[PDB]
Structure formats: structure tokens, C-alpha cells
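Supplementary Methods S3. Input chains for the assembly prediction are listed below.
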Amino acid sequence: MCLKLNLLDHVFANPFMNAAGVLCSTEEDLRCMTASSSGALVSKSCTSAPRDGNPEPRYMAFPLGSINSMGLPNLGFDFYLKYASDLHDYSKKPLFLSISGLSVEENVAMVRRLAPVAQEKGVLLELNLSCPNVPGKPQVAYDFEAMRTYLQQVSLAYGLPFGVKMPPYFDIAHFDTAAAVLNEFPLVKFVTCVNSVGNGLVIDAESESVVIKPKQGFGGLGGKYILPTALANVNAFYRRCPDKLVFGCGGVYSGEDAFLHILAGASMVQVGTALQEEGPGIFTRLEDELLEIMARKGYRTLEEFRGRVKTIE
Amino acid sequence: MCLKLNLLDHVFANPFMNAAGVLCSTEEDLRCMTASSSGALVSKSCTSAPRDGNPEPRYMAFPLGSINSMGLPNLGFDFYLKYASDLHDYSKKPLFLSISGLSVEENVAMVRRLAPVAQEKGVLLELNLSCPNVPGKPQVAYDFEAMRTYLQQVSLAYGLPFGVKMPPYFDIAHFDTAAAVLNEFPLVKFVTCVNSVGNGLVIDAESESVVIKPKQGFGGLGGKYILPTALANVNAFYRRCPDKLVFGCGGVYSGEDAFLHILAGASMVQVGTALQEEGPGIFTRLEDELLEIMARKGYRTLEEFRGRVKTIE
Ligand SMILES: Cc1cc2nc3c(=O)[nH]c(=O)nc-3n(C[C@H](O)[C@H](O)[C@H](O)COP(=O)(O)O)c2cc1C
Ligand SMILES: Cc1cc2nc3c(=O)[nH]c(=O)nc-3n(C[C@H](O)[C@H](O)[C@H](O)COP(=O)(O)O)c2cc1C
Ligand SMILES: O=C(O)c1ccc2cc(CCc3c(C(=O)O)[nH]c(=O)[nH]c3=O)ccc2c1
Ligand SMILES: O=C(O)c1ccc2cc(CCc3c(C(=O)O)[nH]c(=O)[nH]c3=O)ccc2c1
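Predicted C-alpha cells for the full assembly:
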């Protein structure tokens, strides 16, 4: 029985990795992810210049999940490019680099300079499209014309396979439109579903207060709250993008949750909230748990059940 | 200390009611809700003609909430109109009738008939701005021009104060656009936030199957999964629509959850999944729990804390 995968011309010991943003901002965090049992890691979404992000408290977690308005704190692109080019040990596992420029021009600037490193060292680009653009307009992936522009400019600038990180959608017409846009771009080889569920609001009953400071307490939701949403999106894109991979992200706490993602169509399975809460030991647990469900069911490999969710009648 | 309140020129024993769709389809159901301790009741969204809805299984519940693709089963508008006009006992509590016509014309036709019953008996209209999927088009409340159309035509045809049932939004620009639409219409006197979170997917690990038959297992989510979404929408509209009331719906299982919805801004608090799972007994428990938390905090009225959620700094 084995959790091995070979995709995007890389070899992965297992499907598990962190979710962008969690345990991946500093060198220390990237070394820790690298030392862990995960099959891959992704670096924190970056911008051209370093950012401090939003005022604290800006992340809080609870039994059913988490809320955040981090505001894209990061060490700047040159840092993550240097980690990719000079520091990462690719003999340990593959690296994804996430970018999240605040305009199309910022993303173009970064991917231009990432290209040669991607070509030489094999770092894989994850472009975050659940990201602000002009304030007062929707985030990039909820503005299909902007999404198209972004993908056109980055495809031209970068010129190598990449993937995209998507927000969740909630309407079939949006699933249809979004996948149609993605399918215009042959270089988009993977689609990671999903980013956080936007603009949730957690309120503490005792203090009568919101729990994060930015944005009057509104923030993106992760964890147990979002698993059926995540699954839906994974499957919706898996069905609509047959020439792309789908990576699943949202609500993974256990090997059972990872199994569901994989039955929905996931190749890699990313872990955000649960990893934030439990720490990198989670990856040995998830591995063990997923192998046990496979043993019970008689599955020897991931391909035997990936995307094989049954429907009724 | 009692929970009684006045809204919309009606008196309510307490702020609780069922969520549309739950325990409200048949005469038996409406009578059961009327006999309960709820402050109000709302009928099942209706269409001009009866509908059988989608194949079963079409609802399932779990520890964290529910998933449904009911397909708008209902007894048809004439039945609900007759309930409102001849059968409901208004001395017991107010009645809301939910309409969910499949085009603007259908909604106009129903509301033209409801108006004189509203004038005579005081039944209240809740217009549902969710709808069956139509390939190539989003749900009405996710198509702002369509929403404006509906509201323009209903307002003209109906001519009396009414409310609107909204799906959740996840993007502040969308909150700003939606609330601007709503505030064009002075007759929209309440906004109910939220309907189910659209197009989730629940998968059973043992069977490797989705759990509802319609739509390849995709359906609207309710219950614990959606509470922070629901609170966000309640507060976003409460902030943006100062001349309207906001009714909260989503994720209420306890008086503490009701308390949070009121702190976010809700005037009435609707109960869907929890009511479906626990039955109408839930309303005595919710009342007791909400009064207990009020007593512990020293609140004598709902007005003392409605919309008074605190932000940080
Ligand atoms: C603290 C924190 C920071 C995050 N930062 C990013 C980010 O920089 N880029 C991104 O693509 N997603 C980011 N996300 C979203 C996660 O990658 C993930 O999509 C989301 O948390 C859902 O997965 P989960 O349910 O496992 O938490 C962040 C989430 C959290 C909790
Ligand atoms: C079985 C069922 C049927 C429902 N039908 C309707 C409906 O006819 N009209 C409507 O506005 N909302 C309908 N809903 C949505 C609920 O009114 C409510 O908005 C949603 O379930 C979230 O509240 P909850 O978390 O308390 O379940 C239905 C929900 C369920 C579970
Ligand atoms: O409050 C702001 O000014 C602000 C500015 C920049 C922002 C950029 C992002 C995208 C990164 C990200 C974040 C984050 O960094 O807040 N959190 C997530 O759950 N997902 C993400 O993709 C998300 C939110 C951001 C908010
Ligand atoms: O699947 C279909 O073809 C179909 C047809 C008509 C539909 C009408 C609605 C609106 C009623 C509704 C339902 C419902 O009746 O399924 N469930 C909810 O959670 N909220 C709602 O607002 C919701 C879904 C509908 C789906």
C-alpha cells in the first residue's frame, strides 16, 4: 500500500502539504515544513515588497475552525525566490512558491524572475487568485474579466506550467464560468480548491466582541466549517477541468477528511487550520490514518479511488 | 422579564420563528408551528403551481449541519394564500408567507393576489431571491441587475411593506452592491440573512457516496457550518441598511447562538436545521436559554444589545 504520487514531473512521497500561509513565512518555517513528513510544501503568498500585514489579533481558532485577516504579511519575493534558488533541498521534497501580487503588473514582475529558477530547480508556481485587486471591486477570482487578464498576462510572462489557488464558489453558474476561464489557459496545470470562505464573522458571546481586529472582525474562514464547501469545489473543478489536476484544501483534520477530498478528485491535499493548530506532527497522523482507511477498503494506491465518489442513481 | 417585541406593526411574543422550508409545507406543519412557542412562523416558499420537488433522498443532517436539494416542493400558492386568508389564527402569532416564483412574472402574479390578504389579515411577505439552477445564469441575488428587476416589479405589483430572503455573500464589494440595490426600494422593510450556503457537497467515507440524490450530491448547507457566514451577513446588512430590519438565519441551535445573531443586528431569529432535527420543542429551550444569558448579563431588553457587537480598537 502506498501514498506515492508522480505529477507535474515531480515525485511526492504522499499527497500532503501545508496550505499557503500556514507554517511557511520564514526560513525557520520552511526548514520545519521540509523536515516534516509532508510530501511537499508551499511558501507563504508573497508580494514584491515585504509586508507587515494587518494589526493583531488577526488569526483566531476555535473547535470548528479559524478566522483570519492576516493582510498578506510576508518577507517579500526576493526572499522566497532565494529560498527556492539557493536554500531548499529538493532531494527532500518538492517546493511550491505562492505568489499573490496586489495587481496584475506586480504578479507579472515576479513571475518573470521566477521563470528561470522554476526551469532550473523545478520550483512550482501557485498563483493566488483569491486576492484583492482594486478596492471596491471583488477579489480577482470573483471578477471573471480580471481573472482572465491575470491568467493571460502571467501565462505570457512566465511561459511554464503553473497552478492557481481559487476561492470557493457557491453557484453552479460560477463553477461553469470559472472553469471555462481556466480551461482557456493550457499552462494552468493544477487548480487548488479552496482558499478561505470569505468574510465570515466570529463573535465571542462573553465579551460581546468580534475576535480579530482588522476589518471590523470580518475574515476568511477555514477548518471544519468549510469541508463540504471545499469538497464541492474540488469535485466541481475535477469534473469541469479534465485536462488539469485539482489539489484539495479546506477542512482537513484527519485521514478520513483527506480520503474524501481524494474521492472528490484531489491529487495533493493541503492542510491549513489543522496544521496551524496541531503543528507538523499532523502529517504522520494523516498518513497513518489514510493508509488505514485504504487497508480496510483494500485500496493499494491513490489512483484506485481518486475522483471515484459515487452519485445516487 | 419577557422577550416580546413589536416590528412591522405587529406584536411578537419573542424573536424566534422557523426558517422557510422547515416545518411549514403542509396544513399540519403550519398548525404545528402555530401551536409552538415560536414568536412567528413562515410558510414554505411557494410557486404558482404545486411542485413535487426533487427525487429523494434530498435532505440529510449530520452533527455539524445539513445539506438539501429539496427542489422547491410545495402545495402551490393557492394553498398558502388560503391558509393565510382563512385558516391561520392571527391571535396566536404573526404569519409570513414566502414566495419563490421561477420568474419575475410569476412573482408579480402571486404578489398581486396576496396584497389584499395582507391588507385584510396582516400576513407578511418574504420574497425569496434564490431559485433553481438555470444553465448560463446565476441565482437572482447573485445577478444584481436581475435582483433590481425583481424588486422593482414586486414593489410596483405589491405596493405594501415586504421583506427579502438573501443568499450569503462573501466579498465586501458584493455586500456594498447588494445593500445599495436593496436601499433603492423603500417597501423592502426587512432583509433575512441567510439562505443556505450554496452548492456544498457531503460525502460518506464508508460508502464512498454522496448523500443526496439530486444535483450529483450538491446542495445548500445549513446548521453549524454556516454560523459565522450568517453572522457576517446579518451584520454587513445591519450596518448598510439603517432604515430596514435584518432577520437572522443560519446556525442557530442555542440561545447563545441567537444572542450572537441579535448582537450582530438581527430583529427576528429564524431556525432551520436545528428545528428540523429537534422539532418544535426547540423554541421553549431557545427562549429559556436566551433569557438566561440576558439575566446573567443584566440585559432587560433585546434593544439594549441588538447590533451592539463590539469591534477591536
Ligand atoms: C493564517 C492563514 C494564512 C493564510 N494565508 C494564505 C496565503 O498567504 N495564501 C493563500 O493562498 N491562502 C492563504 N490562506 C488560506 C489557506 O491556504 C487555506 O486555503 C484555508 O485556510 C482553508 O484550508 P483549511 O480549512 O485547512 O484552513 C491562509 C489561511 C490562514 C489560516
Ligand atoms: C429542508 C430545507 C428546506 C428549505 N427550504 C427553503 C425555502 O423554501 N425557502 C427559503 O427561503 N429557504 C429555505 N431553506 C433555507 C432555510 O430557510 C435557512 O435559510 C437555511 O437552512 C439556513 O438556516 P439553518 O442554518 O438554521 O438551517 C430550506 C432549508 C432546508 C434545510
Ligand atoms: O486588509 C487588507 O488590507 C488586506 C490586504 C491584502 C490581502 C491579501 C490577501 C490574500 C492572502 C490571504 C490571506 C491573508 O493574508 O489575509 N488569508 C487567507 O485566508 N487567504 C489568502 O489568500 C487577503 C487579505 C488581504 C487583506
Ligand atoms: O434543483 C432544482 O431544480 C431546483 C428547482 C427549484 C429550486 C428552488 C429553490 C429555492 C427554495 C429553497 C430550497 C429548496 O426548496 O430546495 N432549499 C433551501 O435551502 N433554500 C431555498 O430557498 C432551491 C432549489 C431549487 C432547485
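DSSP finds nine helices and 16 strands in chain B. Chain B has two domains: 1-53+72-196+223-313, 54-71+197-222.
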